[PDB]
Design a binder for this molecule. Structure first.
Ligand SMILES: Cc1ncc(C[n+]2csc(CCOP(=O)(O)OP(=O)(O)O)c2C)c(N)n1
Ligand SMILES: Cc1ncc(C[n+]2csc(CCOP(=O)(O)OP(=O)(O)O)c2C)c(N)n1
Ligand code: SF4
Ligand code: SF4
Lengths: 195, 195
């Protein structure tokens, strides 16, 4: 079973107690690429999206039908996508625009929830999230309180107030701030995708 | 008529006594672009090839049926070409490869001319050109001596020796070293063509 430990994730020993979310890929024995991505998944894999350029990182990272990126016990893990060899930077840039747009729709539904007859504990977590929606730790902190209070709050609501809470529940996957990562080889970064 | 003067071309006064090879373009009144290219034509227009990106410099520089680039009294002037907006640097890079290839074919025909029964004055200019074929001034100096001696040399030759001199006459336009210039706007250089 999982064991909650307070080892500092900023150290080598503390980081390896986190579950790896990149495992058993098709890279060569002793590859110099996969250890880097594996460490990133152990630190921020809970909330990251990957835009991967075509290359080795896309061949051992995304050759059908096997996917080396996995999830933790909570079912959360990095979402992985590879478009083309030359557009990987702009591909990931587009994701950052969209993810910000999805969080903006949620913040609007949360601000409207403040004006609705909902529980005082629910209003407390919403105000805390709006102030730290762009902070990785704070958005996870107040977001989880919102996720925990939503099912009981929806049961106690009705009419258009219930629809407002149901719209927040539909977008609760954008409470936690995401981390966009654009991964590629030197051939992509130094040549075809440098522009 | 043309007046040979020994004013230093490196000064402003000396450069303007050279004939401009960019005249009467379609640029705006007081454009900040055309004065730059005009000065380049007055210095090296005798032996330059232009790879121009799409933009203002291609619209006032190459809108049919009027061409603003002209020639001097000797009939020599810049050759101008525009491929696309995004490839102008590689377009001009390809020209530099080809021009070097054309000079290489000429140097082979000149080295073979040293082994042929030709005039002593012709052999003197060929040895001088081979040593300075990559120097702008020296290649023009010894090249013009070769161009001046060729018609009399061809008249005095026969057989395969005459064919060797006729092959040099076919390539005499690559004695003088060329100057490849890649002209474009900031939109080309900073964005789409920066890679
Ligand atoms: C537009 C385009 N050009 C070329 C290719 C072929 N291609 C696939 S991967 C690759 C190079 C990978 O080198 P690098 O970016 O350094 O990644 P690495 O494999 O070294 O990790 C190339 C040229 C392609 N798929 N698409
Ligand atoms: C592939 C492509 N994209 C866009 C264009 C349209 N286009 C023509 S000129 C130009 C911009 C010119 O700006 P700049 O490079 O700064 O030159 P300037 O006109 O300022 O001298 C653009 C976007 C094109 N012709 N081709
Ligand atoms: S980068 Fe590619 S080829 Fe090189 S060791 Fe890793 S998997 Fe093998
Ligand atoms: S750059 Fe183009 S638009 Fe600007 S002054 Fe020159 S010709 Fe006119």
């Amino acid at each position: 079973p999982e064991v909650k430990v307070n080892f500092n994730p900023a150290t080598v020993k503390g980081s390896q107690f986190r579950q790896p979310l990149l495992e058993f890929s098709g890279a060569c024995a002793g590859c110099g690429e996969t250890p880097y991505v594996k460490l990133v998944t152990q630190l921020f894999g809970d909330r990251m999206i990957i835009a991967n350029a075509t290359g080795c990182s896309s061949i051992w990272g995304g050759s059908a039908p096997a996917c080396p990126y996995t999830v933790n016990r909570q079912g959360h893990g990095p979402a992985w996508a590879s478009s083309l060899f030359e557009d990987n930077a702009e591909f990931g840039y587009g994701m950052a625009l969209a993810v910000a747009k999805r969080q903006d729709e949620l913040a609007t539904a949360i601000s409207k929830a403040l004006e609705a007859p909902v529980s005082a504990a629910f209003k407390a977590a919403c105000e805390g999230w709006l102030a730290g929606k762009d902070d990785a730790d704070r958005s996870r902190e107040y977001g989880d309180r919102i996720k925990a209070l939503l099912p009981g709050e929806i049961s106690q609501a009705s009419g258009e107030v219930k629809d407002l809470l149901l719209d927040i529940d539909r977008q609760k996957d954008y409470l936690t701030k995401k981390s966009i990562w654009i991964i590629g080889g030197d051939g992509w970064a130094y040549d075809i995708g440098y522009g």
